[PDB]
């Protein structure tokens with residue numbers, strides 16, 4: 001037998017929170033949560049299913065809720081609770097600067113080496129934590145990392161996350177070919193080491209300020225390109241030191257890839273001397289009613 005999952009799933013009354021405005025279209029809202037009987041306001045993102053007249057859609061969102069409730073790490077998104085109105089609502093920590101994909105696209109000109117490499121560290125810590133929790137994300141991508149502040153990012157989108165057991169077996173869907181390990185595209189094998197392949201791609205997105213991997217290459221062709229030994233090119237800002245780490249994440253032998261713990265170490269060494277490891281034009285010259293009882297979710301802790 002495995003260790004029991006004693007995560008608490010918190011049920012919230014719809015009256016505990018206020019939708020302030022729409023971020024995306026079901027529909028994600030920016031809002032505020034007052035925990036019942038506590039003098040605190042918590043900035044939240046409220047993910048509300050549209051119809052939910054789909055029994056299928058409901059399993060998907062509750063699986064997400066299951067996983068986000070069972071994770072507690074500074075570099076992974078946690079659930080504050082769920083609301084069981086007509087439409088099931090996930091309440092989570094608001095990540096006000098949006099996805100790191102949009103953030104690096106929008107801010108190409110203001111992002112220096114210190115921020116890129118620290119991001120690579122934080123995503124490695126997030127991902128190592130999940131590995132410690134025997135969790136395979138299966139959808140790591142710069143779009144699925146959110147920005148709390150420019151100094152603080154979190155892995156999100158646990159919709160595809162599964163427990164390990166090594167090779168996890170899948171059986172269809174709309175899948176992110178350009179981020180996936182070869183063994184995942186060919187045999188639907190997913191491991192922590194398939195997650196290291198997508199970490200690799202995620203880092204290439206950051207280091208290219210959000211370029212599209214294999215842009216203008218049909219997904220049908222990716223498996224053959226990879227089998228032919230082709231990989232994404234060295235980004236302009238990347239020293240061979242940084243690119244060689246990306247390349248090792250894209251080895252065909254899964255056990256020849258680095259471990260998330262090793263990636264933490266290698267990126268931290270690089271983060272102590274960022275301008276040795278990334279070369280960016282103008283790097284040194286770069287900067288990035290009642291709110292009284294507002295507390296960030298990260299300072300809002302309930303008994304464990």
Ligand SMILES: */C=C\C(=O)Nc1ccccn1
Pocket residue numbers: 023028045076077078092093094095096098146154155156157
């Ligand atoms: C890590 C919590 C989370 O996913 N929050 C979020 C989602 C969408 C927009 C903003 N914040």
Ligand SMILES: [Cl-]
Pocket residue numbers: 063066067161162163
């Ligand atoms: Cl699950």
Ligand SMILES: [Cl-]
Pocket residue numbers: 118121268271272
């Ligand atoms: Cl560091």
Ligand SMILES: [Cl-]
Pocket residue numbers: 302303
């Ligand atoms: Cl409490």
